[PDB]
Amino acid sequence: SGAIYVGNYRVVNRHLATHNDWANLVWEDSSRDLLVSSTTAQGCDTIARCDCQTGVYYCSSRRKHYPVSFSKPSLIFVEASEYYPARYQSHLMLAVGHSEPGDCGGILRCQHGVVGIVSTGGNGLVGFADVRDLLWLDEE
Ligand SMILES: NC(=O)[C@H]1CCC(=O)N(Cc2cccc3c2OCO3)C1
Ligand SMILES: [Zn+2]
């Protein structure tokens, strides 16, 4: 689990969105595994606006924050799971690191702010859904 709170927006994995998130839906994309809902209170996170390929992510299944090198956002094939059949997921960045399903929502950050959240894993890899292209998260 995990979310990003920026301005009056809440960013979560689409597969973990609640009934309140869907009732207060701003934007969602199944192919990215992302959902953004509106909030009443102001958030304190800053979204990175950069092309960084190094950062740190939180892994709940190890209670540890790991430094990683990660690939640029791309279209990657993702095996079937409890929440989606086998498909290509867009805007996905991979790194060599530990990840389990319940780790989804863990933040990846660089020196500029939040880069994305854990969304995939397996075979010693961890995948993150990028949020740096969602420029509208910074305003209105
Ligand atoms: N974005 C998606 O398609 C996710 C939907 C929910 C889900 O359980 N996964 C599988 C998964 C995630 C993280 C870590 C893993 C993993 O399987 C093994 O380790 C993929
Ligand atoms: Zn950066």
UniProtKB/Swiss-Prot annotation:
Parent-protein residues present: 869 to 1008 of 2193
Subunit-structure text: Homodimer.
Protein name: Protease 2A
Active site, per annotation: 15, 33, 104
Ligand binding (Zn(2+) 1): 50, 52, 110, 112
Job of this protein: Cysteine protease that cleaves viral polyprotein and specific host proteins. It is responsible for the autocatalytic cleavage between the P1 and P2 regions, which is the first cleavage occurring in the polyprotein. Also cleaves the host translation initiation factor EIF4G1, in order to shut down the capped cellular mRNA translation. Inhibits the host nucleus-cytoplasm protein and RNA trafficking by cleaving host members of the nuclear pores. Counteracts stress granule formation probably by antagonizing its assembly or promoting its dissassembly.
Catalysed reactions listed for this entry: Selective cleavage of Tyr-|-Gly bond in the picornavirus polyprotein
Cysteine pairs bridged by disulfides in the record: none
Originating species: Coxsackievirus A16 (strain G-10)
